[PDB]
């Protein structure tokens, strides 16, 4: 008789010593070599990651029955806090989903600005041995971990600061104070205990910078705390002439009647901060979706509406195809969101951000009152990888940063159109032989 875990260790799943700790989720239906190095949610919650005491799951959409099954049998009764933004009927339904599990508690994040959402995806995992933070891009439903391209950043195991000892536990990237500020912004009583947990742990080894959005109207220096101004500030402080900027996302908001309203004026301005720049946006074409592993139903998680699109056809000339031969994921539609700054030959990059924030004013913020107020509607969270954090001036592509899609990006062809979810596509069948007819 042999111990079931004999011969397996956490470094079979994680890449020991890799400074980025950026992983993709496992994709069903691709060759095994493309899932070596990937992680499934069962992996992250495995007893090899630590002896679980309690956890908090920040997310947008939850399938609670499915979620509980992803925790190892031995940990399924540990306290879980679901932090969500649902109200009224949606909220009631989430409570009903959680009702069978007495160990599950809920925290409704305040959304006091209209049309905001709680879009952050993060796990706080408390163990006997320490604390782990996981910031990622997947909803807590089966489909998001099945055949999509998703990203995950995994923190090191943070040890607990000893009883009677005092130290800051802060990293050179200020990740501890920044995460505490992000959580404090919820003004959520149920998060107090989790804020205390973070205070009690040593996060000094952290080498990424936190980039959060939280709802509100921020003035003065508070404008630099969140979303695109936060990115701007970090790039000015810690970061490249005609280096392009790349954005890659799964949904697009109404950006305005032309590129000068917001996209090129304030958003790109924040992104091209370092210390005529080309902007390349990657978003699946209809053809990308049609021939995906899922076929057209993958488009159900790319919610760009015709009502939005028809007001900004100017935007589509910035669009580039989803191509991920590098990671065997060209047919695994993206739900990850990433932004980065490659060199003109795309051989290196000045920085890379993985986040839940799509290409929208709601997520990144939009200036109001002649540039004195930044208004954000939603909660979002991501982590920024800066070469200076590792003692480098740039990362090489493939010190080498694992970019999950192909570079250089490939421009849409003359017959390509961006995936728009609520119009019919009836001229060519998808991977499963079906047409798409919503309604």
From Swiss-Prot:
Keyword DNA damage appears in the UniProt entry: yes
Mutation effect (residue 150 to A): Slightly reduced hydrolysis of the covalent intermediate between the active site nucleophile and DNA
Phenotypic consequence of residue 121 to S: Reduces the activity to nearly undetectable levels
Positions bound to substrate: 121, 337
Enzyme Commission number: 3.1.4.-
Impact after mutating residue 335 to N: 15000-fold reduction in activity
Tissue and organ expression note: Ubiquitously expressed. Similar expression throughout the central nervous system (whole brain, amygdala, caudate nucleus, cerebellum, cerebral cortex, frontal lobe, hippocampus, medulla oblongata, occipital lobe, putamen, substantia nigra, temporal lobe, thalamus, nucleus accumbens and spinal cord) and increased expression in testis and thymus.
Record site feature (Interaction with DNA), residues: 360
Subunit organization: Monomer.
Disease entry from the Swiss-Prot or TrEMBL record: Spinocerebellar ataxia, autosomal recessive, with axonal neuropathy 1: A form of spinocerebellar ataxia, a clinically and genetically heterogeneous group of cerebellar disorders. Patients show progressive incoordination of gait and often poor coordination of hands, speech and eye movements, due to degeneration of the cerebellum with variable involvement of the brainstem and spinal cord.
Protein name in UniProt: Tyrosyl-DNA phosphodiesterase 1
Organism: Homo sapiens (Human)
Full protein segment contained here: 149 to 608 of 608
